[PDB]
């Protein structure tokens, strides 16, 4: 629902989702063949499922086609410094794709907003929903649309008949946390084809033995995982598959 929904939010108030007490596989998110741009710093895009972390912070918002290059640490612009700042130690994983067939319509889709003016910079990982009129001079205006007072929040220009560099791109960032705590969500070991009657090596969560897997004729009780024998040797392990 974070990816496929009926509508999204803006950049001044974006959706914040936390993944806790869950397990997922990042292999389906790589072979989708539907994303436009895919950048992932801090870790390789193909070896991030083995090593896992404590928490996963995912934010979803909309952005134009010419601003997808601004989501990176080490540059200054208009959106990456007033809406969402990227720190130096940013080990995130950004994913973007083009879905102009849902967030655009004839007549002009101006549903989402953005912040253009701001007094100063902001600390990264901080949301700004201040709708106060940014004063550029030294005299008050009592919130009027006259001189020396402009509204920072401005509308969009989304149109489904545009080109490529000005289309609404669904951009998401998957950040990881590193603290003194167990992994709330971790990348699990992938399964492998089942093979028997051959000299294989398996690791069924409690041992790493080398041998064959013959079909037994005895059924175990549905509360055990391993099995010993008379000679005190674990030679019967239930397959969790």
């Amino acid at each position: 629902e974070v990816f496929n929904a009926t509508r999204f939010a803006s950049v001044y108030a974006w959706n914040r989702k936390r993944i806790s007490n869950c397990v997922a596989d990042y292999s389906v998110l790589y072979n989708s063949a539907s994303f436009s741009t895919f950048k992932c710093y801090g870790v390789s895009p193909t070896k991030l499922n083995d090593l896992c972390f404590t928490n996963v912070y995912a934010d979803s918002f909309v952005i134009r086609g010419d601003e997808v290059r601004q989501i990176a640490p080490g540059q200054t612009g208009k959106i990456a410094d007033y809406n969402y700042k990227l720190p130096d130690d940013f080990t995130g994983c950004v994913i973007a794709w083009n879905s102009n067939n849902l967030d655009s319509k004839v007549g002009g889709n101006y549903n989402y907003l953005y912040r253009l003016f701001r007094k100063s910079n902001l600390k990264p990982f901080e949301r700004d929903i201040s709708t106060e009129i940014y004063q550029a001079g030294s005299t008050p205006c009592n919130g009027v649309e006259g001189f020396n007072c402009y509204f920072p929040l401005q509308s969009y220009g989304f149109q489904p008949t545009n080109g490529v560099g000005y289309q609404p791109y669904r951009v998401v960032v998957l950040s990881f946390e590193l603290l003194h705590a167990p992994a709330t969500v971790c990348g699990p070991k992938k399964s492998t084809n089942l093979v028997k009657n051959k000299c294989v090596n398996f690791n069924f969560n409690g041992l790493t033995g080398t041998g064959v897997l013959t079909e037994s004729n005895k059924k175990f009780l549905p509360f055990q995982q391993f099995g010993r024998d008379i000679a005190d040797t674990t030679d019967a392990v239930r397959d969790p598959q």
């Epitope: 936390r18 990982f125 929903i129 919130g143």
Partner: antibody, heavy 123, light 111 residues
Framework: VQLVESGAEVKKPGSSVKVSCKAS????????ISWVRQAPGQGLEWMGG????????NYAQKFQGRVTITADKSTSTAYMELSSLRSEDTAVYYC?????????????????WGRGTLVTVSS | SVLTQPPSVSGAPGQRVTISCTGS?????????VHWYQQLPGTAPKLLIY???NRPSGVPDRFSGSKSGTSASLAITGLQAEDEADYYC???????????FGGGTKLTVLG
């Protein structure tokens, strides 16, 4: 400032209701205005919030496309239109004001509220 | 909906009475601030405390708000003759794409 609303109003089950929100003074054409309802029996819901400067609608996903909220800059008022009423619409609406701030949370708060409009529909 | 509350809470006029707000890890535990309101049966609700760190104008300092991880708490000291109302827990939900209120607890003496 103080926001005044209309009194009690009844309608037909399947017609349109026309209420308004008046503002006394200023500080209405610079901040966002939302509508919060309340019905005896359950909690408080939130239909959506409308900005008067840009005139952009922002509703929720739980409410379908059946209510429209407009804004006016000439007299600084807002109107509410809701047709095809049901038997659950017996509640009261409030004309609230939002004042954003900065911080790690940045949640929408309702510092200024309205009076209330009792809208009861039945046979 | 996604926010639950106890239906009633008992207290004594002179002790500390606390309440808890429990939700999910995407609306309150994600990092969003919580807002507490008071629903008096006979007038419009007003603002009591925003962000659990600041104090608005016109409210007493007896209300204390805190956020312990994924749950918010409200603590009061002393029961006066104006606490016959309902307390609601409001937080911004991303799955609902907007603000959602809580259930509401009743705290009053029948007398």
């Amino acid at each position: 400032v103080q926001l005044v609303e209309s009194g009690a109003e009844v309608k037909k089950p399947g017609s349109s209701v026309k209420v308004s929100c008046k503002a006394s003074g200023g500080t209405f054409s610079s901040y966002a205005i939302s509508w919060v309802r309340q019905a005896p029996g359950q909690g408080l819901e939130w239909m959506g919030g409308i900005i008067p400067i840009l005139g952009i609608a922002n509703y929720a996903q739980k409410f379908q496309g059946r209510v429209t909220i407009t804004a006016d800059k000439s007299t600084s008022t807002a109107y509410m239109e809701l047709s095809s009423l049901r038997s659950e619409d017996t509640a009261v609406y409030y004309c609230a004001r939002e004042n954003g701030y900065s911080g790690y949370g940045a949640a929408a708060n309702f510092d200024l509220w309205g009076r209330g409009t009792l809208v009861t529909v039945s046979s | 909906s996604v926010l639950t509350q106890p239906p009633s809470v008992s207290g004594a006029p002179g002790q500390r009475v606390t309440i808890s707000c429990t939700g999910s890890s995407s609306n309150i535990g994600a990092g969003y601030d919580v807002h507490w309101y008071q629903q008096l049966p006979g007038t419009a609700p007003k603002l009591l405390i925003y962000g659990n760190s600041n104090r608005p104008s016109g409210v007493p300092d007896r209300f204390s708000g805190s956020k312990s991880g994924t749950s918010a708490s409200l603590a009061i000291t002393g029961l006066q003759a104006e606490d016959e109302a309902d307390y609601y827990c409001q937080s911004y939900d991303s799955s609902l794409s907007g603000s959602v209120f809580g259930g509401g607890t009743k705290l009053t003496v029948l007398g």
